[PDB]
Amino acid sequence: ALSRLAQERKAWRKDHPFGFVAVPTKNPDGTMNLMNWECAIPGAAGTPWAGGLFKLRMLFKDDYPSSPPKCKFEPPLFHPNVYPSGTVCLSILEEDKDWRPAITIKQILLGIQELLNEPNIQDPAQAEAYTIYAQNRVEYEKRVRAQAKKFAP
């Protein structure tokens, strides 16, 4: 996991999508904690999410990339497919489901950006955001814009 995570950190530093942030944290001994990254996803242009910089943590297990990272918005995000805890539910983020070791951190972050304006109402992760989306898309979009202004950098 460390060699792959260091390879992806090196790759991230040389080139990454504009507006995105992905940085390893520090271990209690001072070394870089490659298993825990503080990330940020900008809201996509031309969507109600624009202007916001949505912070999230990527937690990697010892066997990454055989296992997906756990992705969690901090603080919790209002989105039909983000659990109340902040954990992002994306099928590629489940080992037994669509995770593949060829998937990279850059692809995950780009995919979570896509998820922001493309929620899946068939299987929602939180009652709050989904209920608003289901009853009133005008109120749903206003709640999204208000949250984008709340998380503006």
């Binding site: 039909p80 497919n81 539910c89 994306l90 099928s91 590629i92 489940e94 489901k97 669509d98 998937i103 692809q107 995919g111 896509e114 998820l115 493309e118 929620p119 899946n120 299987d123 929602p124 992760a125």
Partner: peptide
């Protein structure tokens, strides 16, 4: 990239 929320 089979991307769909869950």
């Amino acid at each position: 990239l089979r991307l769909r929320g869950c």
